[PDB]
Symmetry: C4
Subunit: 229 residues, 4 copies
């Protein structure tokens, strides 16, 4: 169309995409100030008014660029994200949870979508994630199995830490991060169950070894790429 | 045999091995629910009945596939494991410790045996372990030597941490993981023995250095393999 | 000039640059003793007298070598540093903050400027920093976004940790370092907000993954250099 | 000599060196039991008698093999070690400190000297240490500079942590290991000095970055060796 091409050379234009990047950064400062109580008592109104100005601007633009690109728009990871955070954003406050108001703050991630240098590095990081899946598999299972013995051994006498399969899952996640694993968990346990270290000193070893391998794994696969290039 | 070949094309068949993978996952959910007290009051019976249905199914199948494969079955790492967790499983409750009931939960690791993609990655992880043996050697010795001085210096005045060669071994294992090493151990010690940091700041250095090397070691040996391939 | 060349073969001479390296090390021992209260009661005077002897010596030499090298001197990173720590040093005590007196202690970093082997390794370390910028970018943004939800969710009931966008930034920096993240932060939170782990167990994962990549990233880029050499 | 060659084919013989490896392991078990109080009340005598049997055996053998090898013996790292732990060992108890009795326990490291596979890996680990010297240099200096400001800023109001240049050095060593750096140090400080995070959040960054580089450094230098081989 003699206009469909005038609409595309608008949307696909630099100024338009660079414009909503200046409207991203102007909004991220606003979210920053809006947490201030002092700022909110004075400049609260402008702000909440400013916040409606943008959301129609984006719904304008999410409408424009979904028209420009029709059904291709919907098989794009970045675009779908922009659709699903604007959508999230459009449903208003005091309806349902208000946790959605705090989730609205995800729309800042658009700056990663809109900025190419940023979508590059995010594609790097995600490019890594298929290779580690089998380890994440094995690993999840391993946690599962130990959550179950740990509950079965300790949940009745240590209910804050092991009375639930999830309570155990969590504590175990923490012990893996080595976070007060001894003085705060294993050591308190050996006051009652004195051979508790048999369960944890092995558990630490396996998940640390598995981690070390997971990482050497990334570093070797990052290397097949260099020699191949 | 005109049947030994009908028994092999059963056992070695996809549906049969994929069948006991669906009987693995159905059992792992059951172990999950069985930790719940609510679930156990209602659906306890079905469950404990379900648990006997499987164990005869596996002892059926561990019998079948030990017949199909005779004495080869017994020099296979995965198969031996399946024999030794089913065996563990067959001895019943309220005999000996009941810690064996919690050890029964190891039979979930069959999912790593039955799933090829999973036995692949487990063979990777174990493939690594010969190379690090000399470091694990040196390392064990080093811990040993320090357990002995640490007991000899601190066990009489700090018996929860150093009165035993093992008590020391453990605390030292913990200090290596940097887990409250200072605010919870070395610092409390310098209230009595003020030059205790002479023992620990060196000890941290050596075991951290040895670890860093152990890891660079894995990463270099993972590299001889790439250029060789 | 028949003297400009006699001034250059002084400044650019070994003995002159090696001289102010012996005047660096003599001064760093002095700063060391000067923290002692005993030393300061006796040898305080000599010392504070000694400290004025050097600062005129350096302002002598910073004047000489800025003359020898005119405006080239001012586009050199090491030289500019030497200018800006001597300058810092020249403004005296009891004027403004006295935090500048503690900042005077930065002039020890001249030993890294004056010693080539040392400016080599510092140029290595800084040589690394362009490549990680996009990750430091993404990363800063990510922290920002979570500071804002974390304040919005927890600052009213946990003001020491989340009542400020910065208070949150800090706590979050700490949680990233895994430092009492559970027993000291997330666990205290679940006494009031029981699904707080939904915010933190994801947050730990993302920033740990991003870190692992940041590091594998350094190691791969250090490798393009070897094959290229 | 018609005997100097009979003395060398003794010392240099397998059985002789393998003999004192069985006398090493028999002694290391003895040190292990000797920490037990029960064992020492019964079998104490045998033991302390056993301990004199070996020390003359080694002084026999350290005499033999210093004769076999004359002055070459004294420029060998492993041999010198064996001389200097036996020497340490020969001076008896209740003279000077008794800390030397606990230092006698170092003679177990002979097992690393006597076992080739073990002296191999120890030579690997030490082979690494020249390359990191410039970083250990820079690093020591950096710690030094911060010890001095940290004392100058905090030692008067926090004397257990910063009243000494060494007290500071230690605390700083601990903060580097991230060990309760926040909840136990920086956080307690901001109750008095509220912009203390300006000193520590930078300090953590620099020493973590320097560490990451130190390690990528080992991994790259371990790689020049592979392509060169
Ligand atoms: C491409 C990538 C890795 C292979 C590669 O090319 N480089 C290494 C991906 C693509 C397909 C992936 C697997 C399957 O989806 C399912 C599989 C079964 C487990 O039960 C659950 C996860 C497993 C291990 C997955 C991870 C595995 O890692 C694969 C092979
Ligand atoms: C193959 C592998 C490493 C060599 C390799 O090919 N790549 C590296 C394995 C195979 C044989 C291994 C050693 C011996 O069992 C005993 C030996 C004596 C110590 O007192 C205790 C452990 C030691 C160091 C073992 C570890 C060592 O690592 C070896 C050489
Ligand atoms: C050379 C180096 C990396 C490329 C390379 O050669 N090796 C990898 C440097 C040089 C120029 C750098 C970027 C720009 O200054 C701005 C850019 C936009 C972000 O919003 C903020 C930071 C970004 C990602 C910077 C980091 C990036 O990493 C670049 C490409
Ligand atoms: C061989 C090795 C590294 C070079 C190499 O071949 N591979 C990297 C070693 C051998 C000689 C070493 C230096 C000197 O003793 C003194 C020097 C001055 C500092 O003020 C204090 C330490 C410095 C940086 C030392 C470390 C440096 O690392 C060198 C070059
Ligand atoms: C952008 C999308 C991101 C999707 C994220 C995908 C999840 C990836 C899982 C990686 C994170 C696992 O979570 C984290 O793993 C590290 C591995 O460094 C482990 O952490 C522990 O062991 C490793 C051993 O290698 C050490 O490096 C680390 O210092 C220690 O704390 C813990 O298990 C946990 O802190
Ligand atoms: C599937 C079978 C598995 C068999 C397991 C074989 C055991 C292998 C030993 C490796 C585990 C040693 O146990 C663990 O080692 C790590 C090394 O990362 C050390 O951990 C500490 O030092 C290292 C330095 O490299 C850091 O990476 C780590 O963050 C820190 O906590 C501790 O010593 C201990 O937490
Ligand atoms: C000389 C000038 C220096 C300029 C400094 C530039 C800043 C560079 C940023 C690197 C430092 C980031 O700060 C530090 O990052 C490490 C990454 O190891 C993270 O630390 C955590 O995760 C990583 C996972 O890789 C683990 O290695 C580490 O043991 C764990 O504590 C934390 O986020 C923080 O402790
Ligand atoms: C056999 C002789 C041995 C001689 C020993 C020579 C000393 C070598 C110095 C290396 C040890 C430095 O001491 C240790 O360094 C590690 C680096 O992993 C740092 O540790 C911290 O930062 C690093 C970042 O890389 C992380 O890997 C680590 O999990 C974290 O705790 C600390 O600074 C200290 O725990
Ligand atoms: Ca900790």
């Amino acid at each position: 169309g003699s206009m469909y091409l005038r609409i595309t050379n608008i949307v696909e234009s630099s100024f338009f995409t660079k414009f909503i990047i200046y409207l991203i950064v102007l909004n991220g400062i606003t979210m920053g100030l809006e947490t201030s109580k002092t700022f909110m008592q004075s400049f609260g109104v402008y702000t909440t008014l400013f916040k409606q100005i943008v959301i129609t601007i984006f719904t304008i633009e999410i409408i424009l660029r979904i028209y420009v690109h029709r059904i291709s728009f919907f098989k794009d990871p970045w675009s779908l994200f922009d659709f699903f955070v604007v959508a999230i954003s459009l449903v208003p406050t005091s309806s349902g949870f208000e946790i959605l108001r705090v989730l609205r703050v995800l729309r800042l991630f658009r700056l990663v979508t809109a900025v190419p240098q940023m979508r590059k590095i995010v594609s790097a990081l995600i490019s890594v994630i298929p290779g580690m899946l089998s380890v994440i598999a094995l690993m999840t299972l391993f946690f599962y199995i130990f959550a179950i013995m740990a509950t079965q051994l300790f949940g009745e006498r240590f209910p804050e830490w092991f009375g639930t399969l999830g309570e155990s899952f969590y504590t175990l996640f923490q012990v893996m991060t080595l976070e007060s694993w001894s003085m705060g968990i294993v050591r308190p346990l050996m006051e009652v169950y004195p051979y508790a270290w048999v369960f944890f000193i092995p558990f630490i070893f396996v998940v640390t070894f598995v981690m070390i391998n997971l990482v050497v794994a990334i570093i070797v696969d990052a290397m097949a790429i260099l020699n191949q290039k």
